[PDB]
Design an enzyme around this catalytic site. Sequence first.
Site: not given
Length: 387
Positions: A41-43, A225
């Site tokens: 998934t994703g990057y 973050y």
Amino acid sequence: ICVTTHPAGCEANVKQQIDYVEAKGPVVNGPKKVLVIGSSTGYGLAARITAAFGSGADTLGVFFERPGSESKPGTAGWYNSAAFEKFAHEKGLYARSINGDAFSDEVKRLTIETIKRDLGKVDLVVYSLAAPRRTHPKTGEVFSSTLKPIGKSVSFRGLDTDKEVIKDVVLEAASDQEVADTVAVMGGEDWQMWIDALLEADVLADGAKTTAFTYLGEKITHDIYWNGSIGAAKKDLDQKVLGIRDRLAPLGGDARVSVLKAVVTQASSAIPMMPLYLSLLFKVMKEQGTHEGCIEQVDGLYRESLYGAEPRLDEEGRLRADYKELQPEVQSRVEELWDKVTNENLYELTDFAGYKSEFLNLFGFEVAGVDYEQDVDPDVQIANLIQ
Ligand SMILES: NC(=O)C1=CN([C@@H]2O[C@H](COP(=O)(O)OP(=O)(O)OC[C@H]3O[C@@H](n4cnc5c(N)ncnc54)[C@H](O)[C@@H]3O)[C@@H](O)[C@H]2O)C=CC1
């Protein structure tokens, strides 16, 4: 919230990413044999698609996904990987996958064994693991990551995505132990273990490259973050890469931390402040014409920095693909709108419609060209998968 998984929509999602890479053309001087840790998934999935369909690379993917059976759909990453290998085998490429805990020593042993038998050596190692927890492969101790600020608690106006309501929230600070756990999970130790183990077994080719993905963001997110618990883990990544890059020197290789833009994934939709930040950022960047998703970021990272002539660097030695998000014209308008967003202007001052749409794209819903009134068949198998 739970969202089920749509197998047909996931395949169309993979095909559309493949179409984007192929339209941009081959990746000149790109890799030919890539190992992607976190490739479903994703990057990480974008990295596997850019390698196979931009460079013609054989790919071995490692992920942790629930398979599908009769009348019980697996996870989106399962159907993503199933579709990837089906398209990759069409073009003649080698595509195999390992389903297991990448933090464990056995998966590293199986990955090394598979590379020896199937590929010999690998060109590039993409490290894109997004885990809420990690079991130490030597002491069985389980670490759970936390997304809290360090020092002082933080107040801000969040977004209840289910009730579609702006909520006043407060995030307490993180203890020294929560930060230590988060560094253990999201830091660089396991990536450090991976490259070490791949080096002893001599399955790293000459000039081999490895990169790990990270996020830095701008001032609006720094308290949660970068200067929070999760940022201390990504800060540990910058210390580890210096050691990794040294061990790869006798090969003539390189190790880099790659910074990418904020994107709706299953791992970032959970982060505090992210739903409202992504809804605002999507609207500001769309009207500005710089809105990008997963495949655009990683395809550009391959072409310009990982294998380009003039890489997009920063003063710490990181490769950068996130520059459009951090621009003052984008950030200052997101900051101005954040306060003026209420329950009534939600869809008018933000792109909450886009956030919701892209979130459902992750599971295969609201994907263009998919017929959603047809029976879903959740029994999709992956040939030659290793468990
Ligand atoms: N999503 C974002 O907005 C940003 C993400 N990044 C970074 O990129 C990396 C990738 O994250 P995302 O693509 O967003 O997440 P994601 O949830 O979409 O991808 C996670 C991947 O890792 C695999 N995985 C998770 N735990 C595993 C385990 N124990 N063993 C084996 N495989 C495992 C999953 O199967 C999946 O393929 C992360 O390090 C993240 O911090 C970079 C910039 C911003």
